[PDB]
Amino acid sequence: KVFGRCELAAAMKRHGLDNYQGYSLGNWVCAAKFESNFNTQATNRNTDGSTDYGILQINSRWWCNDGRTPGSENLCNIPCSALLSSDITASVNCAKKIVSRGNGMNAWVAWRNRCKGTDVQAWIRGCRL
Ligand SMILES: [Cl-]
Ligand SMILES: [Cl-]
Ligand SMILES: [Cl-]
Ligand SMILES: [Cl-]
Ligand code: NA
Numbered sequence: 001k002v003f004g005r006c007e008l009a010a011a012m013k014r015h016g017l018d019n020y021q022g023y024s025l026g027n028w029v030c031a032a033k034f035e036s037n038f039n040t041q042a043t044n045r046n047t048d049g050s051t052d053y054g055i056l057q058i059n060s061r062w063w064c065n066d067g068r069t070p071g072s073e074n075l076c077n078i079p080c081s082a083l084l085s086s087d088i089t090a091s092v093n094c095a096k097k098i099v100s101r102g103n104g105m106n107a108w109v110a111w112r113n114r115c116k117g118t119d120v121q122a123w124i125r126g127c128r129l
Pocket of ligand 2 (some may be wrong): 005
């Protein structure tokens with residue numbers, strides 16, 4: 001599913017990401033824009049042999065099981081394919097664990113490099129939330 005911007009904002013708010021670990025909703029929408037272009041089906045292979053999955057490009061080494069990432073932890077206890085669903089619940093639950101870990105949203109390199117320090121509230125402008 002390719003979410004609309006306000007559609008994704010509403011879903012992330014409903015699932016409790018607005019202000020989660022102090023990160024306002026626009027941070028999460030901006031992260032999703034640059035990680036996945038709002039596409040739940042996005043996948044991208046990393047140089048270490050892991051793969052990133054879903055709207056927030058969650059990685060198979062630490063977080064989800066894809067059956068092909070040797071030495072993988074599955075700290076979210078899900079199959080990585082759960083992260084490609086039109087239902088963002090599994091991505092949100094796993095993102096909450098990731099962002100709680102100690103480096104916060106710096107875990108998402110697209111967030112560091114294209115959202116951090118910017119006017120992220122622009123990403124929820126116009127939305128009825
Ligand atoms: Cl929308
Ligand atoms: Cl957009
Ligand atoms: Cl915001
Ligand atoms: Cl959803
Ligand atoms: Na894994």
